[PDB]
Design an enzyme around this catalytic site. Structure first.
Site, PDB file in Angstrom:
ATOM      1  N   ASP C  59       0.835  -1.193   0.000  1.00 24.30           N
ATOM      2  CA  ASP C  59       0.000   0.000   0.000  1.00 24.30           C
ATOM      3  C   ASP C  59       0.873   1.248   0.000  1.00 24.30           C
ATOM      4  O   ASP C  59       1.895   1.308   0.688  1.00 24.30           O
ATOM      5  CB  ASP C  59      -0.926  -0.002   1.215  1.00 24.30           C
ATOM      6  CG  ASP C  59      -1.836   1.210   1.259  1.00 24.30           C
ATOM      7  OD1 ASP C  59      -2.714   1.329   0.377  1.00 24.30           O
ATOM      8  OD2 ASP C  59      -1.677   2.042   2.176  1.00 24.30           O
ATOM      9  N   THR C  92      -4.213   6.536  -2.391  1.00 21.65           N
ATOM     10  CA  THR C  92      -2.874   6.784  -1.872  1.00 21.65           C
ATOM     11  C   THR C  92      -1.830   6.811  -2.984  1.00 21.65           C
ATOM     12  O   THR C  92      -1.304   7.869  -3.328  1.00 21.65           O
ATOM     13  CB  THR C  92      -2.468   5.724  -0.829  1.00 21.65           C
ATOM     14  OG1 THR C  92      -2.932   4.435  -1.249  1.00 21.65           O
ATOM     15  CG2 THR C  92      -3.067   6.057   0.529  1.00 21.65           C
ATOM     16  N   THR C  93      -1.533   5.641  -3.541  1.00 22.72           N
ATOM     17  CA  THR C  93      -0.433   5.504  -4.486  1.00 22.72           C
ATOM     18  C   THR C  93      -0.680   6.302  -5.759  1.00 22.72           C
ATOM     19  O   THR C  93       0.277   6.691  -6.437  1.00 22.72           O
ATOM     20  CB  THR C  93      -0.217   4.029  -4.834  1.00 22.72           C
ATOM     21  OG1 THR C  93      -0.577   3.214  -3.712  1.00 22.72           O
ATOM     22  CG2 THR C  93       1.241   3.770  -5.183  1.00 22.72           C
ATOM     23  N   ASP C 390      -8.669  -0.226   4.038  1.00 27.53           N
ATOM     24  CA  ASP C 390      -8.866   0.311   2.699  1.00 27.53           C
ATOM     25  C   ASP C 390     -10.085  -0.281   2.006  1.00 27.53           C
ATOM     26  O   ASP C 390     -10.477   0.217   0.946  1.00 27.53           O
ATOM     27  CB  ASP C 390      -7.621   0.070   1.842  1.00 27.53           C
ATOM     28  CG  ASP C 390      -6.402   0.810   2.359  1.00 27.53           C
ATOM     29  OD1 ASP C 390      -6.511   1.476   3.411  1.00 27.53           O
ATOM     30  OD2 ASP C 390      -5.337   0.729   1.713  1.00 27.53           O
TER      31      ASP C 390
HETATM   32  N1  LIG Z   1      -8.510  -5.387 -12.621  1.00 28.18           N
HETATM   33  C1  LIG Z   1      -7.978  -4.169 -12.874  1.00 28.18           C
HETATM   34  N2  LIG Z   1      -7.791  -3.740 -14.141  1.00 28.18           N
HETATM   35  C2  LIG Z   1      -7.263  -2.532 -14.416  1.00 28.18           C
HETATM   36  N3  LIG Z   1      -6.883  -1.665 -13.463  1.00 28.18           N
HETATM   37  C3  LIG Z   1      -7.013  -1.963 -12.149  1.00 28.18           C
HETATM   38  C4  LIG Z   1      -7.580  -3.263 -11.775  1.00 28.18           C
HETATM   39  N4  LIG Z   1      -7.593  -3.299 -10.431  1.00 28.18           N
HETATM   40  C5  LIG Z   1      -7.080  -2.128  -9.977  1.00 28.18           C
HETATM   41  N5  LIG Z   1      -6.734  -1.332 -11.008  1.00 28.18           N
HETATM   42  C6  LIG Z   1      -6.139   0.024 -10.899  1.00 28.18           C
HETATM   43  O1  LIG Z   1      -5.111   0.049  -9.902  1.00 28.18           O
HETATM   44  C7  LIG Z   1      -5.141   1.293  -9.198  1.00 28.18           C
HETATM   45  C8  LIG Z   1      -4.785   1.087  -7.730  1.00 28.18           C
HETATM   46  O2  LIG Z   1      -4.815   2.330  -7.036  1.00 28.18           O
HETATM   47  P1  LIG Z   1      -4.450   2.378  -5.472  1.00 28.18           P
HETATM   48  O3  LIG Z   1      -2.947   2.352  -5.336  1.00 28.18           O
HETATM   49  O4  LIG Z   1      -5.285   1.338  -4.768  1.00 28.18           O
HETATM   50  O5  LIG Z   1      -4.977   3.829  -5.021  1.00 28.18           O
HETATM   51  P2  LIG Z   1      -4.919   4.266  -3.473  1.00 28.18           P
HETATM   52  O6  LIG Z   1      -3.442   4.336  -3.172  1.00 28.18           O
HETATM   53  O7  LIG Z   1      -5.630   5.599  -3.435  1.00 28.18           O
HETATM   54  O8  LIG Z   1      -5.644   3.153  -2.756  1.00 28.18           O
HETATM   55  C9  LIG Z   1      -6.537   1.872  -9.389  1.00 28.18           C
HETATM   56  O9  LIG Z   1      -6.465   3.254  -9.752  1.00 28.18           O
HETATM   57  C10 LIG Z   1      -7.179   1.054 -10.492  1.00 28.18           C
HETATM   58  O10 LIG Z   1      -7.535   1.880 -11.604  1.00 28.18           O
END
Ligand SMILES: Nc1ncnc2c1ncn2[C@@H]1O[C@H](COP(=O)(O)OP(=O)(O)O)[C@@H](O)[C@H]1O
Ligand SMILES: Nc1ncnc2c1ncn2[C@@H]1O[C@H](COP(=O)(O)OP(=O)(O)O)[C@@H](O)[C@H]1O
Ligand SMILES: Nc1ncnc2c1ncn2[C@@H]1O[C@H](COP(=O)(O)OP(=O)(O)O)[C@@H](O)[C@H]1O
Ligand SMILES: [Mg+2]
Ligand SMILES: [Mg+2]
Lengths: 49, 527, 526, 537
Positions: C59, C92-93, C390
């Site tokens: 994360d 976050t990321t 989360d």
């Molecule tokens: N099955 C999938 N196919 C395409 N993109 C995905 C899939 N699962 C997650 N993602 C992408 O991965 C990203 C993960 O973001 P994340 O690091 O969880 O944000 P945060 O740090 O705010 O939690 C999301 O923006 C999403 O668009």
């Protein structure tokens, strides 16, 4: 405006109140601006002769 | 408590570091060479600023030429040395455009970082840069509009040499162009090899640059040790042996066995030296220049037969004197000189700038050698004009090798940016992105000319593509005032070093390609 | 030794291009750390703590909090991820990569002799147009449907480590928010940190983890004669002590007679029996307090068949007050019938690994629950605890704002074509920094193909051509395979509050770090 | 022979050149943070705290100085916050350039008392000229004067957006706290606006809470966090158990009387809590402390009780809601009366969500309708910058509403004073005319700094600036060129009357009075003696 100007204004007011303080003890004044130092230099020169 | 990460597979170094990959090796070599491109970006162009660079010897170097700055900076990054040695090869080849290498290859590596972080790896950016580099060598013969062919005299080269002068000496573009015209044309070999070593610079501390001139001959910084300084005949006998007699080689020992051989030895040595000086006085010689020392008996008969003596302690300056007056250095002691005598017009002495000099001035036969006597208020100013003088001699050797010229001042790099973009849009492949980035590296070269003039480079670079609509190919930059409204370069006369542009594109492309080939860096412990 | 006549001693001064282009490289350095932790093909990053612990996570918030930096602009990017962690769950990321890319294109215009206020004024005009684009491509959500809410929380945990147990972690995180959704007065609130406690116990399997319908604590009974299994107890929550303590005064008793010392020792026993008689008037079964219980109070509750727990925490008393519906009273003689926790289900003192745990479960309608996590060790149970936090906050954003944005690259490409078509009517010097904001949004579909190993040239050229038409507009990047699949068929949907907070924080991070042209370091304070 | 002091003595033009370099060391720092093209700085401490700010007072207060001439300019910026509140980068640059031009005069063997007397003839004439060349008071422009004066202060900071979001929230905040006084004094106390910070959404989500925003929590999690038609009970005494004082002790002689004294410590305590709660009071604010025994009576009766609030926050609530700040029992030997008719009123007391914290809001307060601003930023560094920029914006609209007079900003005042004082020095100037002529060149550094930070033309834009102001004084044909300023986004002189670049009058009157008075004290350091530090004896 600054803390240094008020300390100078305090001493300058006390130097102004002390001038009128000398006029209460002796009600007499002379000319300033190097005036009595010349007269003390000429009259004591004639006194030394 | 707190744990730590140890070595994994090959941590066998004893204090050395290691770099592998794109982020640790390739991206860090780009950002290190980007700092050298942003360093010399201010000193690029006619409105460039000087730089007081102090080396390890605690002396001062102030200049605006990018070649002499990198020789004093002790650079330690390995990829940054590749762009320094590429600029040093520009000085050895043509002598001008060393800074053009730092701007172009600094922009080639900077735009390559935008391609590696968005797309293709180094196997296709390098192959994409090589296609646009071969196409850049096909537009440069098509951009030649003028030539240094008609009327090869002091009138035409006074205007064709102003571009190399005004880039480092902006205010003195008129005086230094005439001084380089009366020196380079006067040593012409009558359609032969133009030697740049036949022009020397005699730095005389004194008044300003308006008192500088070029003397047809050589000016030294030594004395006479005599009283025959006024020579008008100037029949010079040049020698390389020390002018003190003929001594033996192995040991040397005077062997006296009687009283007659002791008394006659001192008088016999003076009569032997008397016969050798009068042997060259009967031949008509007036100046006797030697390389080694001179004894007191040689100075006695030099003033008696009224001949002048010149001491030259440097062995390289003695060979230049033989090509000045047309003589030959004789290794043996003084012979009767048959035909290897020198012939000048006036050899005299004068104290100019509190410095007693010896001048071998030619009056009638003017063209044998040239020496530009520069004057300056400081010693640091005369070193900067000497770099501008050497850039004028090196430009004259380029016009001897190739008489073609291209319109500079930003007009060449825009037309190179337009034709490469035309080849990039007609390439149906994945390497067309590096061809479009190769043309944008030519776009940043007139960008450095506008940023040094205090003009906004966005409005400057927009008017260049607007006036280059397929038929002009000559409008550059007018940096004389703000709100430019740029004019033609052939009417102003700003065009220089087509062969300099041919080598600076080739050297900066091969320098930026060699940096991108480095994927793994293994350095040692510096000691 | 004479002092040197200086000014501003032992401090640094730095201005010019070394601060404007220096804060960009500090922002690019942090964005390259967590760049491999965005897509579903991401990897964990093992971290080491100064306390001796180990944080193995992927994360983006938990990684940047364990990094101690010395650069001042690098300290700003860590506080950005802390803001995204408290507002939304899975935001976050994405902000740290986007703020590093918006500053990457901002460094290009600073070399073109452009003022930084021109780029920020173009960033604020671009920020106001990114909010209006997401509200046009949104979709209303039926929050009453159970299968629709499971697809939203599954899209947020596909990146995390609980994507393997996706069928179990989605049902736990959905039932945790729907239990703690309490509304007393006319104000809806969801408190998933004070009432949805996530307790982890080392041992067992992860498939046996489930959200309990009630609370649980690690506390044994005070006496072995007390019952450890009550069917329907009447729980009474206390706050004061059941002991005899000194008053808040200077009380001193002069003992002159012989019967005085034995009377005070008897009045201490009668005072405890008086407050123990006041709590049995409502006929309870379980007495829970926060302070100590003396042995004289344990004797009167033993023969009255009352199970007493001794030292339950204050945060656990507030959590059991919502589950059983009891009132935390602080006076035993002021107990009422409304302060009794009726409606509580089965109470059992189980033992999980040579340690007793008090379970208060099977409630009728609890307003606070406890997620029981059981795994291999405390290392991976801290991962599931950080992933369920989360997973519960992304369900809180849908219940307060039921709008979904097509994620997985389809959100960034739908706005990057909207900023490109709107930039044609600019006709000014702010047109070119307006175009760079649409190009800076490309780093989110760039990351999804760089993590799975796909090509970034053949895919982004086809993905940009899919958004040239106004009909489809929802084509994203499939991180599982690596091709272009529509998000209406995959089911990857992100909430509106996640995507709005991502764009509002990444722009204003570039607003703050572009107005910095000077740095002074070396002074002290109080 | 010489002085036998154990310190250090430096006379002559050494200290006369050191004080100018001490003042220029401060002015060259804050020159990069002036005007709408100014940029913020970074203030990093030794402990690791980072402070991003551009105000002239926050930078010089945290920056350590050693020179005695440097502490004059640092304390000059602290006086501008109390007297005016936004005028605290411009005073430091003027007061340092007043010493730079006076140093060139004393190197020409001109006596500094003629420069001091020459500066007083130019400072009093600058206040005389600015009070006779104002445009209009706050009657013609109306609300457009308050918005345009607010946007001029925000242009140098992080809240300088092109819209009027932050400008309308400041004008609606000062206009809602209009507190009248005796003899017709409509005072506007801007310190009553509680400016709160929270790392949340963007700057466009900054709420304007009409009322008050208390920065505290409810405490016990059994109280209703939203009370409609609330009655606020403002009181300052700790609601804890009845502890006897030092002079009173409990000396019991009978063991039967032991438990009645122990229960009396809570019966007297709960006797106060039942007579303040039976009068309809639902919200109780306390600056002391409410222990866990007394929190039960609010959960049982359904009332909200907020403990450990600030004393400065309780006075802003009780004055705005009509509540009476009660400390104890009173009203003529009464046991427990509480004066129940003096309870406060509120429309709604609601604890909202402020991104993982608790914040209590009071809506419109039913008596005075006060205002509080909750700021929203990305990180804590922006929230500290947004608080300082909002507090300087509240001080601008305070001086305009009090003193109904505005001057054109953007260098329009300094351009008109640069030419009027040159003509003033020629009329009555015999020996002090060189000090009045250098007073005009020192005032030109304010439009000169706007051209440097904008990377525009320097010696041509200011030369075109004073070309319009010269024709407005020597050509009386009603040219109306007294409001000619600078357009830093374009690089041309513009009219500040129609553009809406307005500044208050006393942001330049008090700036010219404080910078001239500070330049006199630093001009009299011809002799300086520095003693050795007495630390270890
Ligand atoms: N099955 C999938 N196919 C395409 N993109 C995905 C899939 N699962 C997650 N993602 C992408 O991965 C990203 C993960 O973001 P994340 O690091 O969880 O944000 P945060 O740090 O705010 O939690 C999301 O923006 C999403 O668009
Ligand atoms: N009169 C002029 N007008 C416009 N540009 C000029 C003028 N004279 C020189 N320049 C520009 O200045 C630059 C100087 O480059 P220079 O530093 O000499 O390259 P190098 O380092 O390879 O010798 C040239 O590229 C040229 O375009
Ligand atoms: N729109 C504008 N056009 C021209 N000048 C402006 C504009 N807005 C602000 N300024 C100038 O910027 C300066 C900012 O001064 P400031 O640093 O706020 O002073 P202080 O430090 O006393 O608050 C003002 O003197 C004003 O003249
Ligand atoms: Mg050149
Ligand atoms: Mg996620």
């Amino acid at each position: 405006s600054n803390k240094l100007v008020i300390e100078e204004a305090e001493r300058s007011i006390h130097d102004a109140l002390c001038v009128i303080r000398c006029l209460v003890k002796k009600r007499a004044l002379i000319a300033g601006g190097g005036a009595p130092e010349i007269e003390l230099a000429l009259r004591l020169t004639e006194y030394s002769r | 408590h707190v744990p730590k990460a140890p070595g994994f597979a090959q941590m066998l170094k004893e204090g050395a570091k290691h770099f592998s990959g794109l982020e640790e090796a390739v991206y860090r070599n780009i950002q290190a060479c980007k700092e050298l491109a942003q360093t010399t970006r201010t000193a690029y162009g006619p409105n460039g600023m000087n730089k007081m660079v102090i080396n390890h010897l605690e002396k001062l170097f102030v200049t605006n030429d990018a070649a002499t700055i990198l020789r004093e900076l002790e650079v330690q990054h390995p990829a940054a040395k590749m762009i320094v040695m590429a600029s040093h090869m520009q000085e050895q080849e043509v002598g001008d455009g060393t800074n053009f290498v730092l701007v172009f290859a600094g922009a080639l590596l900077e735009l390559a970082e935008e391609l590696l972080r968005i797309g293709l790896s180094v196997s296709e950016v390098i192959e994409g840069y090589e296609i646009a580099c071969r196409k850049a060598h096909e537009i440069l013969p098509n951009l030649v509009c003028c030539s240094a062919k008609n009327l090869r005299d002091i009138d035409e080269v006074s205007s064709l040499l102003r571009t190399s002068i005004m880039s480092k000496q902006y205010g003195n573009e008129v005086f230094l162009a005439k001084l380089i015209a009366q020196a380079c044309v006067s040593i012409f070999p009558d359609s032969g090899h133009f030697n740049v070593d036949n022009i020397r610079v005699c730095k005389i501390l004194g008044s300003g640059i308006s008192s500088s001139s070029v003397l047809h001959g050589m000016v030294f910084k030594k004395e006479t040790e005599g009283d025959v300084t006024s020579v008008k005949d100037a029949k010079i006998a040049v020698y390389s042996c020390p002018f003190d007699g003929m001594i033996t080689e192995t040991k040397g020992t005077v062997l006296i066995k009687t009283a007659e051989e002791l008394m006659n030895f001192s008088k016999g040595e003076e009569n032997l030296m008397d016969a050798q000086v009068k042997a060259i006085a009967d031949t008509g010689a007036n100046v006797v220049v030697t390389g080694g020392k001179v004894a007191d008996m040689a100075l006695h008969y030099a003033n008696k037969y009224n001949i002048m003596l010149v001491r030259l302690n440097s062995k390289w300056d003695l060979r230049r004197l033989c090509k000045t007056v047309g003589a030959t250095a004789l290794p043996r002691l003084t012979p009767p000189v048959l035909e290897e005598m020198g012939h000048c017009d006036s050899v005299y002495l004068s104290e100019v700038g509190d410095t007693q000099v010896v001048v071998f001035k030619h009056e009638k036969e003017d063209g044998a050698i040239s020496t530009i006597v520069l004057r300056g208020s400081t010693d640091n100013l005369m070193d900067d004009i000497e770099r501008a003088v050497d850039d004028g001699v090196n430009t004259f050797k380029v016009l001897t090798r190739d008489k073609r010229l291209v319109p500079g001042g930003g007009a060449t790099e825009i037309e190179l940016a337009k034709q490469i973009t035309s080849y990039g849009e007609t390439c149906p492949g994945l390497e067309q992105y590096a061809i479009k980035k190769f043309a944008e590296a030519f776009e940043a070269i007139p960008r450095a000319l506008a940023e040094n003039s205090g003009v906004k480079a966005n409005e400057v670079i927009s008017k260049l593509y607007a006036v280059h609509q397929e038929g002009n190919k000559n409008v550059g930059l007018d940096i004389e005032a703000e709100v430019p409204a740029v004019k033609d370069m052939l009417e102003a006369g700003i065009l220089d070093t087509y062969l300099g542009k041919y080598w600076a594109i080739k050297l900066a492309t091969n320098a930026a390609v060699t940096v991108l080939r480095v994927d793994q860096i293994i350095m040692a412990k510096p000691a | 030794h004479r002092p040197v006549l200086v000014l501003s001693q032992n401090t640094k001064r730095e201005s010019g291009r070394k601060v404007q282009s220096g804060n960009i490289n500090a922002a690019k350095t942090i964005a390259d750390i967590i760049r491999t932790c965005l897509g579903p093909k991401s990897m964990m990053k093992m971290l080491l703590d100064p306390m001796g612990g180990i944080v193995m996570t992927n994360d983006g918030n938990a990684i940047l909090r364990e990094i101690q930096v010395q650069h001042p602009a690098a300290k700003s990017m860590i506080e950005i991820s802390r803001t995204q962690d408290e507002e939304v769950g899975d935001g976050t990321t994405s902000v740290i990569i986007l703020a590093g890319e918006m500053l990457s294109v901002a460094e290009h215009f600073l070399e073109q002799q452009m003022h930084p206020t021109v780029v920020i004024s173009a960033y604020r005009k671009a920020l106001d147009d990114m909010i209006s684009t997401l509200k046009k491509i949104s979709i209303p959500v039926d929050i009453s449907d159970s299968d629709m809410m499971l697809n939203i929380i599954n899209s947020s945990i596909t990146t995390k480590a609980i994507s393997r147990w996706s069928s179990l972690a989605c049902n736990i995180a959905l039932d945790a928010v729907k239990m703690v959704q309490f509304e007393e007065n006319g104000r809806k609130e969801i408190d998933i940190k004070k009432y949805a406690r996530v307790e982890k116990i080392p041992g067992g399997i992860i498939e046996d983890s489930c959200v309990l319908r009630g609370v649980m604590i690690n506390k044994d009974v005070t006496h072995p004669r007390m019952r450890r299994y009550i069917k329907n107890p009447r729980i009474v929550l206390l706050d004061s002590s059941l002991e005899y303590k000194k008053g808040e005064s200077q009380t001193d008793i002069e003992i002159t007679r012989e019967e005085d010392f034995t009377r005070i020792l008897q009045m201490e026993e009668e005072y405890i029996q008086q407050l123990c008689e006041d709590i049995i008037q409502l006929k309870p079964d379980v007495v829970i307090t926060e302070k100590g219980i003396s042995d004289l109070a344990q004797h009167y509750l033993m023969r009255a068949n009352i199970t007493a727990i001794r030292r339950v925490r204050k945060t656990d008393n507030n959590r059991i007050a919502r589950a059983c519906g009891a009132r935390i009273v602080s006076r035993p003689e002021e107990l009422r019938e409304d302060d009794v926790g009726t409606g509580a289900g089965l109470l059992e003192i189980k033992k999980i690994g040579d340690e007793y745990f008090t379970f208060i479960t099977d409630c009728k309608d609890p307003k606070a629950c406890t997620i029981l996590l059981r795994g291999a060790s405390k290392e991976i149970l801290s991962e599931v605890e950080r992933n369920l936090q989360d997973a519960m906050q992304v369900c809180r954003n849908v219940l307060l704002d039921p709008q979904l944005v097509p994620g997985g690259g389809a959100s960034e490409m739908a706005v990057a074509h909207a900023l490109t078509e709107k930039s044609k009517a600019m006709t000014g010097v702010e047109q070119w920094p307006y175009r760079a904001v649409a190009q800076a949004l490309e780093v989110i579909p760039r990351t999804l193909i760089q993590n799975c190993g796909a090509s970034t040239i053949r895919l982004l050229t086809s993905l940009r051509a899919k958004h040239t038409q106004e009909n489809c507009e929802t084509w994203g990047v499939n991180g599982e395979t690596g091709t272009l699949v529509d998000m209406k068929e995959l089911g990857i949907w992100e909430p509106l509050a996640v995507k709005l907070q991502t764009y509002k924080t990444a722009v204003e991070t570039a607003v703050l770090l572009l107005r910095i042209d000077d740095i002074v370091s070396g002074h002290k304070k109080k | 022979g010489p002085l036998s002091v154990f310190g250090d003595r430096s006379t002559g033009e050494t200290i006369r050149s050191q004080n100018v370099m001490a003042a220029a060391s401060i002015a060259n720092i804050v020159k990069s943070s002036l005007g709408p093209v100014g940029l913020d700085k970074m203030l990093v401490d030794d402990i690791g705290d980072v402070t991003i700010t551009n105000d002239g007072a926050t930078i010089l207060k945290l920056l350590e100085v050693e020179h005695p001439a440097a502490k004059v300019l640092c304390e000059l910026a602290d006086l501008q916050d109390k007297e005016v509140g936004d005028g605290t980068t411009s005073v430091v640059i003027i007061a340092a350039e007043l010493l730079k031009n006076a140093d060139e005069l004393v190197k020409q063997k001109i006596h500094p008392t003629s420069v001091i007397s020459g500066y007083r003839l130019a400072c009093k004439e600058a206040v005389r000229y600015i009070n006779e060349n104002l445009i209009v008071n706050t009657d013609e422009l109306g609300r457009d004067c308050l918005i345009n004066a607010a946007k001029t202060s925000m242009s140098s900071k992080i809240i300088g957006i092109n819209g009027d979001f932050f400008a309308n929230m400041v004008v609606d905040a000062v206009l809602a706290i209009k507190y009248t006084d005796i003899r017709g004094q409509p005072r506007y106390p801007v310190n009553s606006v509680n400016i709160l910070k929270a790392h949340g959404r963007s700057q466009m989500e900054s709420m304007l809470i009409s009322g008050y925003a208390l920065n505290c929590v409810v405490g016990s999690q059994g109280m209703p966090k939203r009370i409609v038609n609330a009655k606020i009970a403002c009181l300052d005494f700790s609601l804890q158990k009845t502890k006897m004082k030092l002079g009173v002790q409990v000396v019991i002689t009978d063991p039967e009387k032991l438990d009645q004294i122990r229960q009396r410590e809570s019966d007297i305590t709960k006797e106060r809590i039942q007579k303040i709660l039976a009068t309809g009071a639902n919200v109780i604010l306390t600056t002391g402390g409410i222990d866990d025994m007394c929190l039960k009576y609010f959960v049982e009766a359904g009332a909200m009780a907020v403990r450990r609030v600030l004393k400065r926050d309780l006075k802003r609530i009780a004055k705005a809601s009509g509540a009476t700040i009660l400390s104890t029992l009173a009203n003529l030997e009464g046991e427990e009366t509480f004066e129940a008719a003096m309870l406060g009123q509120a429309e709604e007391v609601v604890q909202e969500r402020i991104c993982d914290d608790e914040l209590i809001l009071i809506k419109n307060t039913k008596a005075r309708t006060s205002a509080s601003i909750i700021l929203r930023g990305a990180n804590d560094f922006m929230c500290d910058e947004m608080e300082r920029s909002l507090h300087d914006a509240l001080c601008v609209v305070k001086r305009v509403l009090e003193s109904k007079s505005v001057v054109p900003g953007g260098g329009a005042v300094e351009a008109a004073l640069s030419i009027y004082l040159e003509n003033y020095a020629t009329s009555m100037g015999s020996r002090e005319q060189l000090a009045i002529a250098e007073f005009a060149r020192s005032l030109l550094v304010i439009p000169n700094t706007l051209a440097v930070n904008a990377a525009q033309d320097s010696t041509d834009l200011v030369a075109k600036l004073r070309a319009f102001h010269n024709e407005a004084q020597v050509n009386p044909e009603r040219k109306n060129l007294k409001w000619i300023g600078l357009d830093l986004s374009n690089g041309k002189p513009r009219d500040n009357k129609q553009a809406g670049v307005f500044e208050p009058t006393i942001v330049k009157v008090k700036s010219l009075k404080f910078a001239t008075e500070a330049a006199i004290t630093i001009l009299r350091i011809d002799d300086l003696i520095k003693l050795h530090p007495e630390s270890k004896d």
